[PDB]
Write an enzyme that holds these catalytic residues in place. Structure first.
Site, PDB file in Angstrom:
ATOM      1  N   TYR A  91     -32.529  28.996  -0.889  1.00  8.79           N
ATOM      2  CA  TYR A  91     -33.114  28.842   0.483  1.00  8.79           C
ATOM      3  C   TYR A  91     -32.560  29.994   1.313  1.00  8.79           C
ATOM      4  O   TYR A  91     -31.492  30.524   1.005  1.00  8.79           O
ATOM      5  CB  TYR A  91     -32.852  27.448   0.897  1.00  8.79           C
ATOM      6  N   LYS A 120       0.746  -1.227   0.000  1.00  7.43           N
ATOM      7  CA  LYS A 120       0.000   0.000   0.000  1.00  7.43           C
ATOM      8  C   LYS A 120       0.802   1.319   0.000  1.00  7.43           C
ATOM      9  O   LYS A 120       0.453   2.257   0.727  1.00  7.43           O
ATOM     10  CB  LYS A 120      -1.004   0.167   1.099  1.00  7.43           C
ATOM     11  N   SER A 124       3.051   4.643   3.236  1.00  5.48           N
ATOM     12  CA  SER A 124       1.965   5.551   3.571  1.00  5.48           C
ATOM     13  C   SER A 124       2.349   6.027   4.979  1.00  5.48           C
ATOM     14  O   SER A 124       2.425   7.247   5.111  1.00  5.48           O
ATOM     15  CB  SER A 124       0.636   4.844   3.639  1.00  5.48           C
TER      16      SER A 124
HETATM   17  O1  LIG Z   1     -26.338  25.021   4.517  1.00  3.78           O
HETATM   18  C1  LIG Z   1     -25.911  24.266   5.459  1.00  3.78           C
HETATM   19  O2  LIG Z   1     -25.373  24.591   6.581  1.00  3.78           O
HETATM   20  C2  LIG Z   1     -26.158  22.732   5.168  1.00  3.78           C
HETATM   21  O3  LIG Z   1     -26.689  22.518   4.025  1.00  3.78           O
HETATM   22  O4  LIG Z   1     -25.782  21.907   6.115  1.00  3.78           O
HETATM   23 FE   LIG Z   2     -27.389  23.837   2.899  1.00  9.37          FE
END
Ligand SMILES: O=C([O-])C(=O)[O-]
Ligand SMILES: [Fe+3]
Ligand SMILES: O=C([O-])C(=O)[O-]
Ligand SMILES: [Fe+3]
EC number: 3.4.21.-
Length: 688
Positions: free
Chosen positions: A432, A70, A256
């Site tokens: 929103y 790895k 790694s």
């Molecule tokens: O907008 C934010 O904080 C989400 O979508 O979690």
């Molecule tokens: Fe959000």
């Protein structure tokens, strides 16, 4: 302490020795040389600490990334010129002129290749010609099929035993014939060219450099050309225009864990600067004696370039080329099945549980993958190991920087264009309202005096709970110190040792404190909200549906059972206060709808699968809720927001920039300036 390089040959150990001598000479970091007969043994030296580093082809970085070894690449050869240097090369198909066959007319011809399992000499070309191989699939090794495709070939390292034809034009002697080393004259990029050159082969599969590097005179070059993928022959310099694939330069891999990366990086830097391109005859890092080629490193590399720690073999390789190697091992049907199937990335247990449960109803169209962090989910999409998930406008930016794009967006109840809406898919998204919530009772808390108090956020990096707030506050002071903005917060995915995580609570067990997934009880929209509701913080950065959906019996999880809307208020930028129902005239900013993101290769299919699944498990879809609701977790908002009316068409905003906006984009940029993710650092590195 000394850095142990692994030589895969005599003349490489030699150089490594001369390399040795002139470092300590010149006072620099020390290099100890190891000897082994091959990459794999060099790859096993490293993992059982018998050497520290080794430089390797793409085909081997792959090998090397597999368990149990790895290894991980820490420095990339850089090629090209100081002016225009690069970390990638071109796998070209080179033939002599006079003849005219195109990339499709190779069946039966004789081919010369760099070696078994090498980007340019195996992996690329064979993957290009698969469609003509008439390959039945496993258990019949593709070899078997190529050995039947071309008449005779030189494929250093193939099994003379099982694949005679494959070793036929190898030019070595006795046991040297068809060897994965210098014993075999036709090995690596220059052998393969000599093969074509000596007329043994008909086509040499190499990198774009080889002919200008091995061929002194320009006019000598005029005897060769390239097979373009468009069944056209172009000159040897139109590589850029005619190549089979564009790939990741070779890389120094190392463990790694207990990598010794520092050192390697430091020895390379120095060695680079001292013996780099014509800097010291006294010894040359990218030059090999006459008769030799590519000792240790790639003759004519111009340096090294660090590989950002977020990167592994898989992400180093690139979705395209990584899955492409994989595929040399699966029937055509299994490869095709994988493509019809949408693998969803789930962030945590809970999201994993619901994903499963959908899986069962997708009728094989949707399967699940998982990670404990969003970013770790964007990294699997990139390794083509997962393919899609719904992201906040904050992760669409990161994803976007990474190359992923918005396919469909969640749609929420409208600007009341209304109705339980029949034409939502085609209904344009509205955004929103990012709001700042506080308890009615703290009459004196205002926008203007919130600073200093305790805050509650959904997680670091999301629009509503981080980017909008932290961003309005940063405009004003320019302070990159996001942890002094509030006294003690709950901002999941921040240092659980830092202030940002002081009020977070982990799970039901006081475990998982301040983690960016549902395990933290205070994570996301609902979680930032309950952080307020239990008077842990004083202000919460959520959207307004969050309060509505979680008050007035709307939520019957005890914590939420008695809250009534009337106890909450939103802080306006104006210094005023308002009731939650007044968020249209009382919000910090307007956030863009979460969007489902995916690689570009998978868009149309994803479209389909999702447009079909929502008909059945959607909000006003068929099996919902006798059978399953895609958009219901119940206030947990798993995989999607519980308030998604549906998944709607883009309307041309289908680049993280068209989608998010000049403004929003500008903004994240500024904030990311104060620091960027290891993940954004990684993508920066694989982008250029
Ligand atoms: O907008 C934010 O904080 C989400 O979508 O979690
Ligand atoms: Fe959000
Ligand atoms: O990339 C290749 O073909 C090689 O390194 O031999
Ligand atoms: Fe290579």
């Amino acid at each position: 302490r000394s850095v142990q390089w692994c030589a895969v040959s005599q003349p490489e150990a030699t150089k490594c020795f001369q390399w040795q001598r002139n470092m300590r000479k010149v006072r620099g970091p020390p290099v100890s040389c190891i000897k082994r007969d091959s990459p794999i043994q060099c790859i096993q030296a490293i993992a059982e600490n018998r050497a520290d580093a080794v430089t390797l082809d793409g085909g081997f970085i792959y090998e090397a990334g597999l368990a149990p070894y790895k290894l991980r690449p820490v420095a990339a050869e850089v090629y090209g010129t100081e002016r225009q240097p690069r970390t990638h090369y071109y796998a070209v198909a080179v033939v002599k002129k006079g003849g005219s066959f195109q990339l499709n007319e190779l069946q039966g011809l004789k081919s010369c290749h760099t070696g078994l399992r090498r980007t340019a000499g195996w992996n690329v070309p064979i993957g290009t010609l698969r469609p003509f191989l008439n390959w039945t699939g496993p258990p019949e090794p593709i070899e078997a099929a190529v050995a039947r495709f071309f008449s005779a070939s030189c494929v250093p390292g193939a099994d003379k035993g099982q694949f005679p034809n494959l070793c036929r034009l190898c030019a070595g002697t006795g046991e040297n014939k068809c060897a994965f080393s210098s014993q075999e004259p036709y090995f690596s990029y220059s052998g393969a060219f000599k093969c074509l050159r000596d007329g043994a082969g008909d086509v040499a599969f190499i990198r774009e450099s080889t002919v200008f590097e091995d061929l002194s005179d320009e006019a000598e070059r005029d005897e060769y050309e390239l097979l373009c993928p468009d069944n056209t022959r172009k000159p040897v310099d139109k590589f850029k225009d005619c190549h089979l694939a564009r790939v990741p330069s070779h890389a120094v891999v190392a463990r790694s864990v207990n990598g010794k990366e520092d050192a390697i990086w430091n020895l390379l830097r120095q060695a680079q600067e001292k013996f780099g391109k014509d800097k010291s005859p006294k010894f040359q890092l990218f030059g090999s004696p006459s008769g030799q080629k590519d000792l240790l490193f790639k003759d004519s590399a111009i340096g090294f370039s660090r590989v950002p720690p977020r990167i592994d073999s898989g992400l180093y390789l690139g979705s395209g080329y990584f899955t492409a190697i994989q595929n040399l091992r699966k029937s055509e049907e299994e490869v095709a099945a994988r493509r019809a199937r949408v693998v969803w990335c789930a962030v945590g247990e809970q999201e994993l549980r619901k994903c499963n449960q959908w899986s069962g109803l997708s009728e094989g169209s949707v399967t699940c993958s998982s990670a404990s962090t969003t970013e770790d989910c964007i990294a699997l999409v990139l390794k083509g190991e997962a393919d899609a998930m719904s992201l906040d406008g904050g992760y669409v930016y990161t994803a976007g920087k990474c190359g992923l794009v918005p396919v469909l967006a969640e749609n929420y109840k409208s600007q009341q264009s209304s109705d339980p809406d029949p034409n939502c898919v085609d209904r344009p998204v509205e955004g929103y309202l990012a709001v700042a919530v506080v308890r009615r009772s703290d009459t004196s808390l205002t926008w203007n005096s919130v600073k200093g108090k305790k805050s509650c956020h959904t997680a670091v990096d999301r629009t509503a709970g981080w980017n909008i707030p932290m961003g309005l506050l940063f405009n004003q002071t320019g302070s990159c110190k996001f942890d002094e903005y509030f006294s003690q917060s709950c901002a999941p995915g921040s240092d659980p040792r830092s202030n940002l995580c002081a009020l977070c609570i982990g799970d039901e067990q006081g475990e998982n404190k301040c983690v960016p997934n549902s395990n933290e009880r205070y994570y996301g929209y609902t979680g930032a909200f309950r952080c307020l509701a239990e008077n842990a913080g004083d202000v919460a950065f959520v959207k307004d549906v969050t309060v509505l959906q979680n008050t007035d019996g709307n939520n019957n999880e005890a914590w939420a059972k008695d809250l009534k809307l009337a106890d909450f208020a939103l802080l306006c930028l104006d210094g005023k206060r308002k009731p939650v129902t007044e968020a249209r005239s009382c919000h910090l900013a307007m956030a863009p709808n979460h969007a489902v993101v995916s690689r570009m290769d998978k868009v149309e299919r994803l479209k389909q699968v999702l447009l079909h699944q929502q008909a059945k498990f959607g909000r006003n879809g068929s099996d919902c809720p006798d059978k399953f609701c895609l958009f219901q977790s119940e206030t947990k908002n798993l995989l999607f927001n519980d308030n998604t009316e549906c998944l709607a068409r883009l309307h041309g905003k289908t680049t993280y920039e068209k989608y998010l906006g000049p403004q929003y984009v500008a903004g994240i940029t500024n904030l990311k300036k104060c620091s960027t993710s290891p993940l954004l650092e990684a993508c920066e590195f694989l982008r250029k």
